[PDB]
């Protein structure tokens, strides 16, 4: 059986001639994915592996579009060809299942659909046989993070030959000798175990499902589908970025009117704890006090921020909070945090409190209190909550029905279901969720639009204490790996880079000041933190104006140019909402450790309109190690027929507001 993208460049062949059912993929008539197996092994049920033959193929197609309530673009186009291939094996130990493939111009998605059939009752998947066999893997280059490690998704990316990527998380991005870029991921991860990729024979990446502590991967009763497995394919790195395939493979919004989900910018009592000017726990340096929170709310009201995150407000942080998962209360504030007074103050100032539920990995202690915790926040005029699951890989703690503790993975079926329960319960309270230590993004924000963002990668916090901090190349890695999954709460915008001393050997963001501004356009998130202490913004009002101006919700986004681990340039048009007219464009560009010159056409600007470009760029002598603050801000009249030369310093960047003129 064969299905092709609408433009014909991607061709999938589904076969039953190999030991199992299999598929392969060509791009512009060159094989990029060799014969790759399909099937399942179960704990007790007979396997779905060899001796299955194709009995039926059903071809359909889609050419439609839909509108996002919020996002990186307003209108999402869905154009794909689709084939459902049915396989059957005669008795004994026979069975039937189908695989549905969707072929887009930008990539492929497929999933298994296992129907009701005799003997398929309570089953436990122990292995998914799905492969991604990369052709010519010996000359391919990959940019990847290890899976099943002690620090979850929070690793810097490795640059290696593809054959050295032994066990990796997704999105898993690489390029072949021809320059074709490919990224493997999944979409709509619901009631199933996350897929890790396990390189078997050279170039053959096998699905490796993250298991329960008992050892099985996925528990199902009867008929079941898998999540989508996705293979993005493009001739250029930015062709991976500019795809909507992940959203397009998710189910439509199930929450109805979600106008109560509000993109915007926020600040927080947060960074001070990471740089040790405050503590989460009680005492003379406690960050989460009534007085401190009102001070932040006053600043947010004056400078245009919607909310103030406050961590350390609830009892349980005293001591070493990493070990306090058993004792956190999610309803009882410390005596110096007056939540009723702050609720009144939020109504006076128009600035909301952003809630915080750190579990330190004990999800049963949280689940027990969750309904009361969200009821408190709904009563307290709280619309957004940051959650946390801080524990090493494989050390989620749950208490089972017999009162016995079990350790689980953050990305097993158990936690996949635990995260979605939290999001669905929050939605009943009109609360949106920002998940730190999350399951990776698989597009579920389409279906549940209150799941607004997540961490799930190294963000700004590692630049306070990472030892080492994130390297200069980190953003240009994230843009073509982590960010292919969806929005990230990176917490950009550190203006004081000197708190541990300058140079290349201290814990600090290893960037220039202008690169910190560029992050608001390079790294998409519907909520964007201005992460620094307020006084550090007051010290640099000219640079701070860009953060005050920049929106977080876009009617269109375009990655204009870039290369994995080297640089990225984004242009985005603001969505008409709140104070934003919908007429302004914004641009952000960042580089890695190298200074880089990038020529850009401005033909993304609307035809026939004049813009005033407000350009925030690295100064003449800027250099991230010892001269990161040199900054030039200039205004230039431009139209779509103009060009721009970006001159990025070492670990530098540029941020531009294109202000439409009336
Ligand atoms: Ca974290
Ligand atoms: Cl993580
Ligand atoms: Cl960084
Ligand atoms: Mg590089």
């Amino acid at each position: 059986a064969t299905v092709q993208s609408p433009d014909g460049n991607i061709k999938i062949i589904i076969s039953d001639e190999q030991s199992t059912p299999s598929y392969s993929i060509s791009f512009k008539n060159k094989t990029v994915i060799n014969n790759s197996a399909l099937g399942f092994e179960f704990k007790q049920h007979a396997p779905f592996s060899n001796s299955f033959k194709i009995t039926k193929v059903q071809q359909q197609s889609t050419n439609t579009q839909w509108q996002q309530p919020w996002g990186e673009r307003q209108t999402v186009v869905d154009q794909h060809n689709e084939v459902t291939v049915t396989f059957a094996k005669p008795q004994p130990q026979g069975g039937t299942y189908s695989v549905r493939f969707k072929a887009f111009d930008s990539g492929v998605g497929f999933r298994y659909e296992v129907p009701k059939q005799a003997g398929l009752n309570n089953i436990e998947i122990t292995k998914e046989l799905t492969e991604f066999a990369v052709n010519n893997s010996h000359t391919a280059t990959a940019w990847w993070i290890p899976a099943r490690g002690w620090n979850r998704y929070e690793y810097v990316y490795n640059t290696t030959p593809l054959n050295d990527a032994a066990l990796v998380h997704t999105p898993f991005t690489f390029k072949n000798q021809d320059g074709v870029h490919i990224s493997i991921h999944e979409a709509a991860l619901v009631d199933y175990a996350a897929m890790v990729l396990n390189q078997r024979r050279p170039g053959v990446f096998q699905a490796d499902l993250t298991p329960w502590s008992s050892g099985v991967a996925v528990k199902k009763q009867g008929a079941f589908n898998t999540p989508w497995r996705t293979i993005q394919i493009g001739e250029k790195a930015v062709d991976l970025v500019n795809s909507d395939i992940i959203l397009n493979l998710n189910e439509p919004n199930k929450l109805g009117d979600v106008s109560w989900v509000k993109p915007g910018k926020y600040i927080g009592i947060w960074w001070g704890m990471h740089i040790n000017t405050h503590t989460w726990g009680s005492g003379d340096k406690h960050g989460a006090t009534t007085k401190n929170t009102k001070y932040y709310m006053d600043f947010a009201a004056k400078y245009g921020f919607d909310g103030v995150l406050v961590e350390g407000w609830n009892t349980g942080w005293d001591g070493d909070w990493f070990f306090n998962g058993d004792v956190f209360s999610f309803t009882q504030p410390y005596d110096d945090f007056d939540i009723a007074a702050l609720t009144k103050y939020s109504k006076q100032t128009g600035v909301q409190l952003i809630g915080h539920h750190e579990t330190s990995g004990n999800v049963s202690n949280y689940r027990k209190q969750m309904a009361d915790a969200f009821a408190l926040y709904e009563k307290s005029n709280v619309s957004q909550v940051k959650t946390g699951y801080v524990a090493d890989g494989g050390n989620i703690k749950r208490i089972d029905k017999n009162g016995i503790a079990r350790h689980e993975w953050h990305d097993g079926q158990f936690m996949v279901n635990e995260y979605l329960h939290n999001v669905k319960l929050a939605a009943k309270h009109k609360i949106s969720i920002n998940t730190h230590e999350p399951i990776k993004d698989t597009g579920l924000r389409r279906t549940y639009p209150n799941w607004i963002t997540r961490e799930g990668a190294r963000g700004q916090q590692f630049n306070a204490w990472g030892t080492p901090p994130n390297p200069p190349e980190h953003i240009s890695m994230l843009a073509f790996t982590r960010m292919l999954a969806g929005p990230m709460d990176f917490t950009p915008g550190i203006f004081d880079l000197s708190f541990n001393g300058l140079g290349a050997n201290t814990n600090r963001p290893q960037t220039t000041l202008a690169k910190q501004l560029a992050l608001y356009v390079v790294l998409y998130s519907p909520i964007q933190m201005a992460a620094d202490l307020p006084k550090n913004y007051l010290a640099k009002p000219d640079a701070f104006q860009f953060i005050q101006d920049v929106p977080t919700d876009w009617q269109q986004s375009i990655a204009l140019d870039g290369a994995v681990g080297d640089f990225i340039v984004f242009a985005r048009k603001e969505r008409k909402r709140d104070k934003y007219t919908g007429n302004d464009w914004y641009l952000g560009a960042v580089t890695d450790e190298q200074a880089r010159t990038i020529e850009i056409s401005l033909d993304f600007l609307d035809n026939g309109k004049q813009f005033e470009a407000h350009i925030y760029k690295d100064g003449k002598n800027a250099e991230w190690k010892n001269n990161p603050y040199d900054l030039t801000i200039e205004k230039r009249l431009v139209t779509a027929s103009d060009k721009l030369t970006l001159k990025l310093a070492t670990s530098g960047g540029t941020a531009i507001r294109f202000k439409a003129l009336l």
Side-chain angles (χ1 to χ4, degrees), residues 1-661:
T2 301
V3 65
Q4 313 182 356
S5 58
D7 65 12
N9 288 326
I10 295 175
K11 302 184 182 67
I12 309 134
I13 297 171
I14 304 95
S15 174
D16 61 8
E17 294 173 343
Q18 311 302 133
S19 49
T20 75
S22 62
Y23 73 100
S24 64
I25 305 178
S26 63
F27 183 59
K28 302 187 174 173
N29 294 322
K30 299 179 176 175
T31 305
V32 295
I33 298 295
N34 289 330
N35 295 327
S36 298
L38 302 163
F40 301 97
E41 300 181 1
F42 308 97
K43 179 183 166 191
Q44 177 64 44
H45 196 279
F48 282 4
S49 59
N50 49 266
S51 306
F52 281 80
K53 299 293 172 283
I54 297 165
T55 60
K56 184 200 280 188
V57 310
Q58 299 174 267
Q59 307 171 356
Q60 324 165 51
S61 58
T62 295
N63 179 17
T64 191
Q65 63 177 231
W66 56 278
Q67 181 158 301
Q68 306 210 78
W70 55 264
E72 70 274 60
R73 60 184 44 90
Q74 175 168 345
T75 303
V76 175
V77 169
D78 184 355
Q79 293 174 333
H80 70 266
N81 292 321
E82 181 170 342
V83 66
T84 301
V85 184
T86 300
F87 303 94
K89 171 184 189 291
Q91 297 299 336
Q93 301 182 24
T96 182
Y97 70 90
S98 299
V99 184
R100 183 177 304 269
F101 296 81
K102 292 180 173 187
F104 305 78
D105 289 347
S106 59
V108 179
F110 63 93
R111 74 172 184 194
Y112 302 77
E113 301 177 358
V114 180
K116 181 181 180 186
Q117 58 200 276
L120 187 83
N121 305 310
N122 296 314
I123 60 174
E124 297 181 305
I125 299 171
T126 51
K127 189 171 291 281
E128 185 179 320
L129 296 179
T130 307
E131 296 170 345
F132 309 84
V134 180
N135 193 25
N136 291 312
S137 68
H138 60 298
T139 55
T141 299
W143 308 274
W144 55 274
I145 53 157
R148 304 271 163 77
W150 72 272
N151 216 29
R152 304 175 317 276
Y153 301 118
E154 288 176 355
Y155 288 90
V156 304
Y157 281 79
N158 306 126
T159 305
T160 75
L162 180 60
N163 284 341
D164 296 347
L167 188 70
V168 302
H169 276 308
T170 73
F172 175 53
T173 300
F174 58 94
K175 68 170 179 187
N176 71 16
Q177 52 177 46
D178 290 330
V180 176
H181 285 63
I182 301 173
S183 188
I184 298 167
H185 189 48
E186 49 181 332
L189 175 56
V190 175
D191 187 39
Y192 205 86
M195 178 180 74
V196 155
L197 297 178
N198 183 338
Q199 196 170 173
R200 306 314 300 151
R201 285 188 179 224
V204 183
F205 292 89
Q206 190 184 54
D208 186 323
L209 300 184
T210 298
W212 292 78
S213 59
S214 68
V216 306
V218 183
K219 307 168 182 181
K220 294 286 187 174
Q221 186 172 86
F224 70 94
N225 303 331
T226 67
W228 295 89
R229 285 74 191 78
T230 63
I231 308 170
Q232 294 186 246
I233 304 169
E235 61 188 21
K236 300 162 284 154
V238 294
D239 296 337
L240 301 179
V241 176
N242 291 322
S243 174
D244 295 303
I245 187 172
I246 299 302
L247 289 172
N248 271 329
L249 293 172
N250 276 267
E251 301 193 71
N253 173 30
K254 290 179 188 306
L255 297 182
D257 183 351
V258 290
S259 62
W260 49 269
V261 180
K262 185 178 164 47
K265 290 166 293 194
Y266 70 107
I267 59 179
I269 295 171
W270 179 72
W271 185 244
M273 281 88 77
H274 286 277
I275 65 169
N276 294 321
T277 63
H278 299 289
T279 57
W280 284 272
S282 65
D284 298 324
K285 294 167 54 188
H286 188 212
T289 71
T290 306
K291 175 168 180 280
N292 286 339
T293 302
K294 290 186 170 183
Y295 164 85
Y296 274 69
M297 290 172 94
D298 289 339
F299 180 89
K302 178 169 182 175
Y303 290 105
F305 295 87
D306 293 337
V308 176
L309 166 71
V310 180
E311 304 193 350
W313 67 272
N314 54 317
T315 61
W317 292 88
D318 288 18
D320 185 347
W321 60 264
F322 182 91
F323 298 104
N324 291 352
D326 292 1
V327 299
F328 281 125
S329 172
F330 299 99
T331 56
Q332 180 59 54
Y334 284 114
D335 288 350
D336 57 351
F337 187 84
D338 187 343
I339 195 168
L342 295 172
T343 298
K344 183 181 172 198
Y345 208 65
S346 78
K347 292 164 185 174
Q348 300 174 222
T349 63
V351 177
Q352 277 178 285
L353 174 65
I354 290 168
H356 187 231
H357 292 163
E358 173 62 62
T359 67
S360 287
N362 186 332
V363 299
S364 296
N365 182 53
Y366 184 33
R367 168 79 79 120
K368 161 116 190 183
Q369 307 181 57
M370 195 179 295
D372 291 336
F374 284 142
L376 171 62
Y377 272 164
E378 187 170 26
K379 166 191 182 179
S380 302
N381 189 35
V382 170
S383 293
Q384 297 180 340
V385 174
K386 177 182 178 186
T387 58
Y389 301 81
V390 174
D392 285 3
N395 283 95
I396 288 291
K397 175 174 170 174
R398 68 177 177 102
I399 303 299
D400 74 9
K401 68 160 148 300
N402 292 117
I404 299 169
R406 310 285 173 199
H407 280 138
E408 305 292 348
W409 292 95
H410 288 73
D411 57 319
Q413 176 184 27
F414 168 78
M415 274 304 295
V416 163
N417 288 337
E418 198 68 29
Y419 290 117
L420 189 60
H421 167 75
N422 179 248
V423 167
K424 290 185 180 176
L425 183 53
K428 295 180 182 168
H429 297 83
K430 295 192 190 321
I431 290 177
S432 297
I433 295 295
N434 167 15
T435 310
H436 283 222
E437 302 75 41
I439 179 64
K440 66 196 177 181
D441 193 333
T442 62
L444 285 166
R445 64 188 164 116
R446 175 182 189 179
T447 315
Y448 305 96
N450 71 316
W451 208 352
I452 51 174
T453 195
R454 76 198 62 214
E455 194 177 52
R458 286 179 55 131
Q460 194 81 264
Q461 63 171 164
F462 281 80
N463 296 333
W465 39 253
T467 317
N470 302 336
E473 72 180 2
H474 186 58
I475 308 300
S476 71
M477 293 292 184
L478 292 179
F480 303 95
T481 54
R482 166 62 179 80
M483 298 311 295
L484 303 186
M488 178 182 178
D489 185 40
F490 184 90
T491 76
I494 294 303
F495 274 20
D496 177 16
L497 304 164
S498 299
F499 50 92
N500 281 321
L502 287 180
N505 301 121
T506 53
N507 283 319
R508 49 160 287 203
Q510 294 191 325
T511 81
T512 67
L513 179 60
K515 175 155 168 186
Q516 290 299 306
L517 301 179
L519 298 180
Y520 289 87
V521 191
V522 171
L523 299 180
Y524 169 63
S525 180
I527 57 166
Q528 293 280 18
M529 200 180 191
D532 213 337
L533 313 178
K535 67 176 180 181
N536 293 328
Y537 293 128
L538 297 173
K540 299 184 169 78
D542 293 326
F544 192 45
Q545 190 65 57
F546 182 78
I547 301 182
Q548 296 175 261
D549 286 357
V550 67
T552 68
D553 192 33
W554 311 99
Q555 56 172 298
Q556 191 53 271
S557 295
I558 317 169
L560 297 174
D561 194 7
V564 186
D566 290 346
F567 74 103
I568 172 103
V569 183
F570 252 107
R572 308 185 194 257
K573 194 181 186 186
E574 72 191 3
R575 179 135 180 198
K576 179 180 153 95
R577 199 197 174 119
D578 304 327
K579 82 171 180 179
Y580 305 101
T581 61
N583 299 133
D584 288 5
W585 283 85
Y586 285 78
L587 177 149
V590 301
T591 185
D592 56 6
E593 74 284 347
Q594 295 192 9
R596 295 184 187 277
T597 297
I598 308 154
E599 315 290 349
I600 291 299
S601 169
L602 297 183
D603 63 9
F604 58 83
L605 296 175
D606 304 78
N607 173 263
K609 295 178 69 163
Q610 185 144 258
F611 299 78
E612 180 185 68
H614 310 177
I615 301 166
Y616 301 75
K617 59 183 171 176
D618 292 308
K620 178 179 178 298
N621 304 132
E623 169 286 297
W624 72 266
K625 297 181 182 173
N626 295 109
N627 201 23
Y629 298 116
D630 282 12
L631 182 76
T632 294
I633 307 172
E634 69 171 283
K635 288 184 175 187
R636 193 198 162 197
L637 294 178
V638 298
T639 69
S641 64
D642 286 311
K643 314 279 170 310
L644 210 61
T645 300
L646 304 175
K647 303 216 75 96
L648 309 191
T650 57
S651 202
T654 290
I656 306 173
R657 175 184 178 188
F658 298 95
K659 176 171 149 196
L661 303 182

